[PDB]
């Protein structure tokens, strides 16, 4: 979520994510924790066996055979953490995640009830208006001319400068606002 995936997926990453999905589906089959511990030790044994296999031709072939075996004997209704994709409470609170700019249309009456908050808010807005141009130039001056980009953001190299493109990560509405 916070990080952007790379251009392509390496082989070790593929293997780790297969390991994770296999252990999760196995937890789903092996509902009881002891059963799960046992068959998870077995699964780690199955992985670690071909762990020092140096060749790549056979490595990818083993990986694809494992993906096939996983798609087979795959729990149709695997466990899915509630707040995660496919879960009960996935976006259950995405209806109360009102952004911040909805306060620029508030009525002075509604505002007089929360004065300190809006003083702080104007402070923040001044902060942003000041840091904008500096972070923009920090971006334009350190783009690799190779021509290929990476989607990742740089930090605030110079002191007194705020990290570029922060007002949407910061100010991000909370995750359970009520």
């Amino acid at each position: 979520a916070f990080c952007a995936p790379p251009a392509y997926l390496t082989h070790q990453q593929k293997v780790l994510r297969l390991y994770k999905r296999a252990l999760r589906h196995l937890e789903s089959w092996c509902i009881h924790r002891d059963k799960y511990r046992y068959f998870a030790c077995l699964m780690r044994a199955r992985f670690e066996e071909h762990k020092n296999e140096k060749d790549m031709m056979r490595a990818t072939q083993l990986l694809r055979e494992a993906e096939e075996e996983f798609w087979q004997n795959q729990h149709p209704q695997p466990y899915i953490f509630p707040d995660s994709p496919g879960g009960t409470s996935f976006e259950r609170y995405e209806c109360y995640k009102v952004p911040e700019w909805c306060l620029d249309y508030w009525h002075p009456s509604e505002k007089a009830m929360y004065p300190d908050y809006f003083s702080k808010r104007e402070q923040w807005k001044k902060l942003r208006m000041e840091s904008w141009d500096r972070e923009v130039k920090q971006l334009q001056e350190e783009t690799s001319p190779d021509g290929i980009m990476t989607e990742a953001l740089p930090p605030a190299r110079r002191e007194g400068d705020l990290p570029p493109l922060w007002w949407h990560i910061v100010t991000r509405p909370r995750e359970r606002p009520t």
Partner: peptide
């Protein structure tokens, strides 16, 4: 149990 609906947990 914090929104958990899956009998397995």
């Amino acid at each position: 149990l914090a929104d958990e609906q899956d009998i397995r947990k």
